[PDB]
């Protein structure tokens, strides 16, 4: 059923992830019980400086609460069937443009769609299951913004091999460099 789980975008990479999905529910009766209404939009790849790549799963927005009880086992099973990759779940959220002086009839644009809000939504959706406890923006002397983002100490072991991957995919998906730090 690899032709059933996509959203009208046929490529080779999405069909191999789709068939990988198809044999991963077959060994488990309850992942069958939750996985069937759970769709995804599209997939793309991105490379990191560590010699490997990263697989980004885009997620339609009301399906995110459905994914938020299955994401850990799905990520670990997809990483131990796909070596030389990094599995990151992110939610496709449409940005609306800022209206100019001549911007015609566009409705009152919701701040859930606005640019800085969707940018840090991509930031906390990047690093699940730990949560962000403080941001801090590092203004370089030469006029360069670097973001420093903090974490909790509860579940550091699932993310600590993926920090540079998160930095690479974040700097490709918003153009802004970032650094991560655990508190002592």
């Amino acid at each position: 059923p690899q032709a059933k789980i996509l959203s009208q975008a046929p490529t080779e990479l999405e069909l191999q992830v789709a068939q990988a999905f198809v044999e991963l529910e077959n060994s488990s009766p309850e992942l069958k019980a939750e996985l069937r209404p759970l769709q995804f939009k599209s997939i793309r790849e991105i490379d990191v400086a560590g010699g490997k790549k990263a697989l980004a799963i885009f997620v339609p927005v009301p399906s995110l609460a459905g994914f938020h009880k299955v994401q850990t086992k799905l990520t670990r099973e997809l990483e131990k069937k796909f070596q030389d990759r990094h599995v990151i779940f992110l939610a496709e959220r449409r940005i609306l443009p800022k209206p100019s002086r001549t911007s015609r009839q566009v409705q009152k644009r919701p701040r859930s769609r606005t640019l800085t809000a969707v940018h840090d939504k991509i930031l906390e959706d990047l690093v699940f299951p730990t949560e962000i406890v403080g941001k801090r923006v590092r203004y370089l002397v030469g006029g360069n913004k670097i973001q420093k983002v903090l974490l909790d100490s509860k579940d550091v072991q699932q993310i600590d091999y993926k920090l540079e991957s998160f930095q690479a995919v974040y700097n490709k998906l918003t153009g802004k460099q970032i650094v991560f730090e655990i508190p002592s």
Binding site: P29, E30, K32, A33, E34, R36, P37, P62, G66
Partner: peptide, 28 residues
């Protein structure tokens, strides 16, 4: 609000699919 009713119908369909497959999950 027809779109709210459509979203409620989609949520009811997802819950109906989950409740239909819960019997197959509890059978194994």
């Amino acid at each position: 609000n027809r779109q709210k009713e459509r979203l409620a119908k989609r949520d009811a369909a997802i819950a109906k699919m989950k409740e239909e497959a819960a019997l197959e999950a509890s059978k194994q």
